[PDB]
Design a protein around this nucleic acid. Structure first.
Ligand SMILES: [Mg+2]
Ligand SMILES: [Mg+2]
Ligand SMILES: [Mg+2]
Ligand SMILES: [Mg+2]
Ligand SMILES: [Mg+2]
Ligand SMILES: [Mg+2]
Ligand SMILES: [Mg+2]
Ligand SMILES: [Mg+2]
Ligand SMILES: [Mg+2]
Ligand SMILES: [Mg+2]
Ligand SMILES: [Mg+2]
Ligand SMILES: [Mg+2]
Ligand SMILES: [Mg+2]
Ligand SMILES: [Mg+2]
Ligand SMILES: [Mg+2]
Ligand SMILES: [Mg+2]
Ligand SMILES: [Mg+2]
Ligand SMILES: [Mg+2]
Ligand SMILES: [Mg+2]
Ligand SMILES: [Mg+2]
Ligand SMILES: [Mg+2]
Ligand SMILES: [Mg+2]
Ligand SMILES: [Mg+2]
Ligand SMILES: [Mg+2]
Ligand SMILES: [Mg+2]
Ligand SMILES: [Mg+2]
Ligand SMILES: [Mg+2]
Ligand SMILES: [Mg+2]
Ligand SMILES: [Mg+2]
Ligand SMILES: [Mg+2]
Ligand SMILES: [Mg+2]
Ligand SMILES: [Mg+2]
Ligand SMILES: [Mg+2]
Ligand SMILES: [Mg+2]
Ligand SMILES: [Mg+2]
Ligand SMILES: [Mg+2]
Ligand SMILES: [Mg+2]
Ligand SMILES: [Mg+2]
Ligand SMILES: [Mg+2]
Ligand SMILES: [Mg+2]
Ligand SMILES: [Mg+2]
Ligand SMILES: [Mg+2]
Ligand SMILES: [Mg+2]
Ligand SMILES: [Mg+2]
Ligand SMILES: [Mg+2]
Ligand SMILES: [Mg+2]
Ligand SMILES: [Mg+2]
Ligand SMILES: [Mg+2]
Ligand SMILES: [Mg+2]
Ligand SMILES: [Mg+2]
Ligand SMILES: [Mg+2]
Ligand SMILES: [Mg+2]
Ligand SMILES: [Mg+2]
Ligand SMILES: [Mg+2]
Ligand SMILES: [Mg+2]
Ligand SMILES: [Mg+2]
Ligand SMILES: [Mg+2]
Ligand SMILES: [Mg+2]
Ligand SMILES: [Mg+2]
Ligand SMILES: [Mg+2]
Ligand SMILES: [Mg+2]
Ligand SMILES: [Mg+2]
Ligand SMILES: [Mg+2]
Ligand SMILES: [Mg+2]
Ligand SMILES: [Mg+2]
Ligand SMILES: [Mg+2]
Ligand SMILES: [Mg+2]
Ligand SMILES: [Mg+2]
Ligand SMILES: [Mg+2]
Ligand SMILES: [Mg+2]
Ligand SMILES: [Mg+2]
Ligand SMILES: [Mg+2]
Ligand SMILES: [Mg+2]
Lengths: 265, 134, 158
RNA sequence: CGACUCUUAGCGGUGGAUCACUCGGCUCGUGCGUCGAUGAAGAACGCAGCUAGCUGCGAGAAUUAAUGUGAAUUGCAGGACACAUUGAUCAUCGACACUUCGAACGCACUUGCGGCCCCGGGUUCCUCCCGGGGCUACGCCUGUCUGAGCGUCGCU
RNA sequence: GCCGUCGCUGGCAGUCGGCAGAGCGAGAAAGAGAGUGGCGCGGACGCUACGCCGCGACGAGUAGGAGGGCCGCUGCGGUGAGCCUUGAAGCCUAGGGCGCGGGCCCGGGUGGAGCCGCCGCAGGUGCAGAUCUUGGUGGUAGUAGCAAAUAUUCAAACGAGAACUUUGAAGGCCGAAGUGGAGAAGGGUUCCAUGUGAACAGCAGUUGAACAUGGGUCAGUCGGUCCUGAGAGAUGGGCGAG
RNA sequence: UGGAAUGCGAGUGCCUAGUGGGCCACUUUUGGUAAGCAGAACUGGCGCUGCGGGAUGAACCGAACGCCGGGUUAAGGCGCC
RNA sequence: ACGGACCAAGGAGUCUAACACGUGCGCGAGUCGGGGGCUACGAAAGCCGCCGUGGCGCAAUGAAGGUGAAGGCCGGCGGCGCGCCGCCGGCCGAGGUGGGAUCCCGAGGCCUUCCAGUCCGCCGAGGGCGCACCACCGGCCCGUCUCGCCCGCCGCGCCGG
RNA sequence: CGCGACCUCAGAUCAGACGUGGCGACCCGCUGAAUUUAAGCAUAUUAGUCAGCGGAGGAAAAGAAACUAACCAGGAUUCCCUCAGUAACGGCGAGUGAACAGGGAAGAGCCCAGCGCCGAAUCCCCGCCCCGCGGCGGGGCGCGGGAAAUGUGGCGUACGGAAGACCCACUCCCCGGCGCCGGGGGGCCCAAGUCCUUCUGAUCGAGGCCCAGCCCGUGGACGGUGUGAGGCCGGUAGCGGCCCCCGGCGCGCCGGGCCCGGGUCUUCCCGGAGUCGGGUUGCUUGGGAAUGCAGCCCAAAGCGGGUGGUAAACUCCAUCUAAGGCUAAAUACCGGCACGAGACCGAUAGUCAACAAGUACCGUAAGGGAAAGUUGAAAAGAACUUUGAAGAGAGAGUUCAAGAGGGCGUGAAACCGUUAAGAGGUAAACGGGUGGGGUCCGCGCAGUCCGCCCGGAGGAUUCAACCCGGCGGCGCGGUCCGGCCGUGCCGGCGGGGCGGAUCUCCCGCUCCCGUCGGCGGGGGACCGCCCCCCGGCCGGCGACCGGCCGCCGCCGGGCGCAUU
């Protein structure tokens, strides 16, 4: 409150009365009279630099950089190592990316959704979300944030015909529309490699949404994939190639440690 | 998950509306499950506990198969008093121990005109729901 | 005090500017409120075009913009007169009228006259009493095909 | 020797830090956007079986009626020929009610003085006395009635 | 000898293995070159390359600048199939240790319901001071003091308890401009009876104007009420943005 | 025959805090009787800096500082402390 | 010299705006949707493209009226007298000097029984193309000053170049 | 003298109405500082801001040009973006500072006086009848009263309007009643474990619940309940259900009003004054030889007047039409009612106020204004005995715990009591180096472990080699087949999408005589790129593999039966 600490008429006694010069509360007859006021060192005073509502809470991010992030999150979602390193139990999902026929877009019952995750071997990720459900340390409990859990798979669909109502009650699941992808859901915490399940219709729109290298995006007015700064990243293969190996000088892998100086005399 | 914009999941608000609930709301809050036999007979799961109901304690020090009559519904303290669920004070006078209605099971229902009307409504809404899915 | 090279700045913060800071946290709510009012207005006036009445073509003033035409306020009385539309009737069939505007040249006059005649061709007109069709009312066959037009009516382009 | 003193540790005090809790705040957002002479806001004084404050209410005073609900309220007692269509309690709230002051209005602000009309009891029509009720404030609009003017006139 | 910094913008992708052959530190440029004619199945470690290794020099510091913190506090997104009533946070500890240090870990006790590690994000984020704020506690200290207005003593009663209460008797004082008997203003129940002796009455109290439970103010004639006083104050009128 | 000796890797650009009270000593030096006075030049110091000696000491003499072992020294010392 | 008897908790470079430079990321002579619109977390995110209006950048200069960013050679003609100006048509063409990481060429040379001469590499005097950057010298655009001879025409001008 | 009209002005407790006061977050009208900055200060700034006064409403105010402009022109008001920290103002210092255009939100336009024509065609009120009556109205009847010619009503208002003539076209538009049919408030309800072991004071904890995976799940928000709960209860979900009330929207009947328009000609009519404008003063603005406002003086015109950002004369142009009025929306909202949420604070924090807080208490008054949360799961709140006058104790008892005993969770430091150990004449304390003594720790006390080999004793799910089967790695298989496939290159009558400031038979509107020319609307061709089909070369399969053949490795089963 902009008034906190200032709803008083405190006045400094000045010097000469053997007390600090902080403004003091007026009148008498109560504990409050003659006490420090206003200053941020005082009990019941005004905090230093009171917080304002016009703090800059919101950040503009360029559209091109946002799309870059969506492209890097999807690329990192097709690599088992990155999905594994995100803690997802995908040790038995048959393939990555995991594409499932469009029938699921018409699921209605939560039991169909659970049965599909079990036959895709995506149920161990859910059981891992059930294990992580616990209470949150700290004041967040007092502020409607008592329960914490980890994220499960992300299901990406083209059209919703009950799939959202089918899956929304399974903890850890997130439903995403292929044409409205979010980096806050694809890369929770800023770390790439969320396990994603794709419907066939959603998987077929990706080229149009983000364009190939040869063909620009069709559903984005003017966009194409970000170019690679390094076409071949297999550094070990590059260094062991005969071309590079022919230009190398012989390695010097002999250690010449310090010699103890003995007096010749 | 809750989607109603006009229902608060705020912890402070929910607790306040629990501990400041008016008497006719505390009645609904003070509801007990029916025994398995009663549930099959009436198709109802829960009833607001009432005086002269016979219940089983299923949690706490006094749990057990003994069936006693409800002798007082102290809605202010959110507890009910049951026959023989009692202890002695220092001076030896016996005192009832309060049990929350959600920790008992209703084995016999005190039935009158209104209680039968309430049971019928609950069984009817359940049937509409069961056929709605079917 | 100035320190080495720099710009001389004169910030306009010598008043009680904190007393009059307009934050914009109600912006998403405003956008939802306006959208909810557009949809409720489109339903109310359906099948009439949601965008509103048809607007005339006009040339932007000054030499910075006179190369561009845009949507005006309303059709001039001369344009309505040349197209044979009564100025009081015009608004009742979704035509915007501007009694203030003049027509200095014939070309702009005729461009808007053609605009009106074209609009009068696409206008589906319902009978006042559905059971009693009248002289000008559109035929029953073309009424069942009437739909609410979204976006400005006959959009203006350069 | 032992006092006294210092240090460290156990235990005990003094104190109320810390931690955990939160029916409170604060901030943002949304819908609505409603006082009063038909007496508002505010104030005073009262009202409970036991009740000081808070709360609620107004001499019908921790409330009446009606509607919904359906067996309590409760700290103790009590049960009206209180309690299941003879409806406990709570909630709602459209009926009825709502003391004194207060724009506050008969005049004044001490519960001081009146005035007009009607009713009732005193005795015994009228008077007189007591009580009850209703009116008696400023400004202002329309209209009504009663008037004023060596104001402008007309007939006498 | 060890620690760190700086420098060599130093070395290591060559772990090239039985599809093998072990080197490139050596004073003095450039190839351990290619070819054409005249029995056993074996061989340490390494390499979070933001990593690892070597060699040499160096190291004071206020004001001030910079870097690095696996230093510390609170909350958010991720993660730890993390911890926890078989005991969380907190707190105490002549217990065992770690780190140059900021600090941290483990043992034991108490406690009773939550909490922490890592990658990021965020900040009302680190106290010895400000005659700092608020709260608490010391020494001083069982100390200064409980000394203005002449004064008490004897016996008994109640009582657990008597210098201080009550009664009786002495000795004193105020000495009618009183320490007497009544009022105004102010107080507001302090008045009266009974009870208590927790707190208060700067010792004590069997006592109190304290606390507790109940009572008590009766009018034609005594005041207000009425009059006007100095004065205050409406209406008419004037002024006035109001 | 990179045209004296010696030593040493240099050039360059942005942004920039604190400071803007100083004071002391050899030599030189103005005013003043002089001052632990006031004012200058040069270098070096204290301020910002510990350490050995001067018993003690901002500045003197020696010497500058990571945590250690051995050895040797400086300026100073070696009756006893 | 001043504050500090003691203990606990609290206690002081923050937030908004503007600017400067440095750094990181995106795109790039462009870039940016911030305002608007479309389509529980979510007030998020996604999209717009005839929503890029608009900002900043892409052009400077002058008070302003305003103007507004290389030339050389060949052939022919008119004028003045091999040289100069103007007009035509064809060729080439964004400067030069010094330094300059890097790159390129290569006199000769890098051994094993001895000669000839090959294929791959490798060092190297000397010699070239010369990045960025710096110094210097020229050029071009706008203002202004001096000098001076011409060229254009729907307006023959106190015109324009 | 009297009587009677009108005018002007009075009195009524006359009949019926209306204003007052409050709240004030936002809004309109006034009035209006000084701290402050200028490193002083006076103009300036602060600031048209605080304070002061008045008036409102759900919004207010504004608002349909006496506008902007100078363009090929726009076209009420308000708000957002930008214009723009710009034109401009300024001890030209400090500082201040708009508008137009452009893009959006929203969008709505109108009415008088006047000039005229209609027999005042107009209005209020009283009485009676019908209807309706908690928004007092509709119809009818009164030689009922009044207002009003010192001007009410209808037509009509700058976009022009009116009357007449002529052609053309017209029956639904509204008011008051009565009846029938398809969003809002309230109430009541609607899934599934208290299953089997077990921890606990109690548990919502742990483990289990056949293939499969306890059960529900459009419900795994939250809260409660003796931890920690989707399934115990309330709820949550749901285009779920039932019941009331209100509203909105259609359809008929009755009694009323209106007797309604377009074009072309003829003739007519047309506007707001102590206002504009000018001088001067004061304030105000970015407005500068004066932006706006106000006082005083002067004081208009009618082809006039106003504006046209440098004073003035002359002259062309442009653009409006002042001095009367109404008007939703987009906009604002720290007050009010009712809600939802949060990277916020967490009892010295957060509002002063988590609690009998604007309370207690202080001040004559205006005003000033705190402190203060926590037993326990449950009061089970300690009966009874005993000492004491009592306060207090000792036993006993409740509880998981009183080592939680009514200001009771935890229970720090300072300070103090006692106990234990050590010590003590240069105040204490402190750095370095040892030594002595304790507290405890090593859960020490005949002292490591590992590999190979030698030897003695034993015991085997017994070794190699071969056979069968599975899997795997690699293959330059010098060049095996098949596949996908090239961000490769070539030939396609290839079947297409996107783009183009590359070219061009059909139509809509439009100028001119039934023709011919112009705008806009579409094919087509062409070029660039991409996708998909087909054929050939080279190519990958190390971000992208199968079948066969070979080699090798591993595993399972045989056989090996013992100098391994
Ligand atoms: Mg505070
Ligand atoms: Mg914590
Ligand atoms: Mg500075
Ligand atoms: Mg002790
Ligand atoms: Mg009372
Ligand atoms: Mg009632
Ligand atoms: Mg009832
Ligand atoms: Mg009086
Ligand atoms: Mg250093
Ligand atoms: Mg200690
Ligand atoms: Mg607890
Ligand atoms: Mg914080
Ligand atoms: Mg402190
Ligand atoms: Mg003494
Ligand atoms: Mg005394
Ligand atoms: Mg007396
Ligand atoms: Mg007396
Ligand atoms: Mg005493
Ligand atoms: Mg007394
Ligand atoms: Mg007066
Ligand atoms: Mg000197
Ligand atoms: Mg200093
Ligand atoms: Mg120095
Ligand atoms: Mg030194
Ligand atoms: Mg000496
Ligand atoms: Mg030494
Ligand atoms: Mg001082
Ligand atoms: Mg002091
Ligand atoms: Mg602190
Ligand atoms: Mg930058
Ligand atoms: Mg939200
Ligand atoms: Mg009256
Ligand atoms: Mg100043
Ligand atoms: Mg100053
Ligand atoms: Mg001053
Ligand atoms: Mg001003
Ligand atoms: Mg004000
Ligand atoms: Mg007011
Ligand atoms: Mg008012
Ligand atoms: Mg109102
Ligand atoms: Mg407008
Ligand atoms: Mg700009
Ligand atoms: Mg100046
Ligand atoms: Mg200003
Ligand atoms: Mg504009
Ligand atoms: Mg719009
Ligand atoms: Mg008229
Ligand atoms: Mg007009
Ligand atoms: Mg349920
Ligand atoms: Mg729970
Ligand atoms: Mg279980
Ligand atoms: Mg739960
Ligand atoms: Mg379960
Ligand atoms: Mg339910
Ligand atoms: Mg529901
Ligand atoms: Mg007008
Ligand atoms: Mg005017
Ligand atoms: Mg002024
Ligand atoms: Mg001004
Ligand atoms: Mg001019
Ligand atoms: Mg208005
Ligand atoms: Mg507190
Ligand atoms: Mg507080
Ligand atoms: Mg405290
Ligand atoms: Mg705290
Ligand atoms: Mg407090
Ligand atoms: Mg506490
Ligand atoms: Mg507790
Ligand atoms: Mg305990
Ligand atoms: Mg405890
Ligand atoms: Mg406590
Ligand atoms: Mg305690
Ligand atoms: Mg001792």
């Amino acid at each position: 409150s902009e008034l906190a600490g200032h709803q008083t008429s405190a006045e400094s006694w000045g010097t000469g009365r053997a007390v600090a010069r902080i403004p003091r509360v007026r009148g008498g007859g109560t504990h409050r009279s003659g006490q420090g006021a206003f200053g941020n060192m005082c009990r019941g005073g005004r905090m230093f630099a009171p917080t304002k509502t016009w703090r800059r809470w919101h950040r503009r991010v360029n559209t091109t950089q946002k799309r870059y992030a969506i492209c890097s999150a999807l690329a990192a979602s097709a690599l088992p190592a990155l999905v594994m390193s995100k803690g997802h139990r995908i040790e038995e999902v048959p393939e990555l990316p995991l594409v499932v026929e469009d029938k699921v877009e018409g699921y209605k019952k939560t039991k169909e959704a659970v049965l599909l995750l079990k036959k895709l071997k995506a149920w161990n990720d859910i059981k891992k979300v059930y294990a992580s459900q616990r209470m949150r340390a700290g004041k967040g409990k007092m502020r409607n944030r008592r329960r914490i859990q980890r994220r499960g798979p992300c299901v990406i669909y083209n059209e919703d015909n009950g799939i959202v109502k089918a899956f929304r009650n399974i903890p850890g699941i997130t439903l995403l529309n292929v044409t409205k992808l979010n980096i806050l859901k694809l890369a929770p915490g800023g770390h790439v490699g969320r396990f994603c399940i794709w419907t066939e219709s959603a998987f077929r729109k990706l080229d149009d949404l983000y364009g190939t290298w040869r063909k620009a995006a069709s559903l984005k007015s003017n966009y194409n994939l970000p170019m690679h700064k390094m076409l071949n990243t297999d550094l070990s293969r590059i260094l062991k190639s005969p071309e590079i190996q022919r230009a190398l000088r012989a390695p010097r892998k002999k250690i010449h440690r310090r010699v103890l100086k003995k007096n010749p005399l | 998950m809750k989607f109603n914009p006009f229902v608060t999941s705020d912890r402070s608000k929910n607790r306040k509306r629990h501990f400041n609930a008016p008497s006719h709301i505390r009645r609904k809050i003070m509801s007990s499950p029916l025994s398995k036999e009663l549930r099959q007979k009436y198709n109802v799961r829960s009833m607001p506990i009432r005086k002269d109901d016979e219940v089983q304690v299923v949690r706490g020090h006094y749990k057990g198969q003994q069936i006693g009559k409800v002798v007082q519904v102290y809605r202010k303290k959110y507890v009910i008093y049951i026959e023989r669920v009692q202890r002695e004070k220092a001076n030896g006078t016996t005192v009832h121990v309060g049990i929350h209605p959600s920790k008992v099971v209703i084995t016999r229902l005190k039935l009158d005109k209104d209680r039968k009307k309430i049971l019928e409504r609950k069984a009817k809404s359940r049937q509409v729901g069961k056929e709605k899915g079917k | 005090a100035p320190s080495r090279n720099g710009m001389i700045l004169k910030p306009h913060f010598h008043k009680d500017w904190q007393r009059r800071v307009a934050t914009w946290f109600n912006q998403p709510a405003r956008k939802i409120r306006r959208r909810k009012a557009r949809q409720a207005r489109a339903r109310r006036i359906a099948p009439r075009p949601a965008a509103g009445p048809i607007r005339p073509i006009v040339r932007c003033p000054t030499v910075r913009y006179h190369t561009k035409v845009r949507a005006g306020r309303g059709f001039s009385l001369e344009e309505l007169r040349v197209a044979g539309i009564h100025k009081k009737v015009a608004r009742t069939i979704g035509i915007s009228v501007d009694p203030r505007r003049r027509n200095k040249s014939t070309e702009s006059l005729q461009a808007n006259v053609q605009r009106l005649k074209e609009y009068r061709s696409k206008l589906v007109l319902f009978p006042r009493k559905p059971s009693a069709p009248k002289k000008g009312d559109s035929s029953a066959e073309e009424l069942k095909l009437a739909t609410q037009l979204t976006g400005p009516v006959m959009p203006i382009r350069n």
